């Protein structure tokens, strides 16, 4: 009598895949002041459960919510397979995984000495991945000189921006990059990254599966969780 899930589903191994996917957005002053910041999250569930279960999801200050039609500390018969359990958005007490610290210095009207420092700010137990930093260059840029201790950088002069790429970097660390911009006689610094944790601080408390028509209880379900945070707009002024 449920239009989103058939009857007579049986899995040998009743498994549960729970992906928490957040996008952290941040607009910072060069001086570290959070000008605007928020997280947009969804909770995707892959569900391999037998029959017609009644499940309860439960997990900090959420602002919006947008559940699936099945939802009613929320109970629901989840469909079979992948579906998005809920969307959400938070704005307070967000973990900002990186601190971008620009520093520019003029040299006459010919040179531009630029130095940019990124600070990771999370358990050093954990690695950030796919780290990319864009430093835009002015339009009247003749050439660019740049060196950097970690990772690689290149002056994508078509895009009129420096792109610095870093494979990994653990938390509570710091790396920098220095550049000389010769020019011909101020958008922000962007970052992208992936972190193995929900920046909002969200963590999943319990997921309970109740099947009273079939021969399994909650002790029987195998339950798995994954947290992944990525950047959206992640810019620093200067």
């Amino acid at each position: 009598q449920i239009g989103w899930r058939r009857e007579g589903i049986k899995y040998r191994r009743n498994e549960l895949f729970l992906d928490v996917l957040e996008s952290v957005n941040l607009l910072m002053s060069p001086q570290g002041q959070v000008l605007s910041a928020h997280v947009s999250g969804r909770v995707v569930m892959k569900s391999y459960l037998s029959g017609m279960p009644e499940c309860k999801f439960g997990m900090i200050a959420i602002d919006d919510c947008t559940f699936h039609q099945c939802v009613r500390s929320i109970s629901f018969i989840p469909p079979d397979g992948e579906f998005e359990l809920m969307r959400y958005r938070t704005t307070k007490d967000i973990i900002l995984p990186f601190r971008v610290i620009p520093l520019v210095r003029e040299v006459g009207r010919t040179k531009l000495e630029v130095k940019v420092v990124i600070k990771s700010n999370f358990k050093p137990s954990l690695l950030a991945q796919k780290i990319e930093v864009r430093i835009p260059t002015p339009l009247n840029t003749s050439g660019v000189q740049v060196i950097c201790m970690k990772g690689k950088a290149k002056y994508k002069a078509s895009e009129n921006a420096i792109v610095w790429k870093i494979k990994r970097m653990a938390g509570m660390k710091e790396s920098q990059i220095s550049a000389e911009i010769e020019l011909l006689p101020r958008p922000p610094i962007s970052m992208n990254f992936e972190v193995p944790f929900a920046p909002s601080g969200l963590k999943v408390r319990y997921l309970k599966v109740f099947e009273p028509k079939l021969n399994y209880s909650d002790h029987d379900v195998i339950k798995w969780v994954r947290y992944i945070g990525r950047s959206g707009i992640y810019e620093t002024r200067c």
Partner: peptide
């Protein structure tokens, strides 16, 4: 890649 257990 990595799913961790929930408990």
């Amino acid at each position: 890649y990595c799913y961790e257990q929930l408990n």
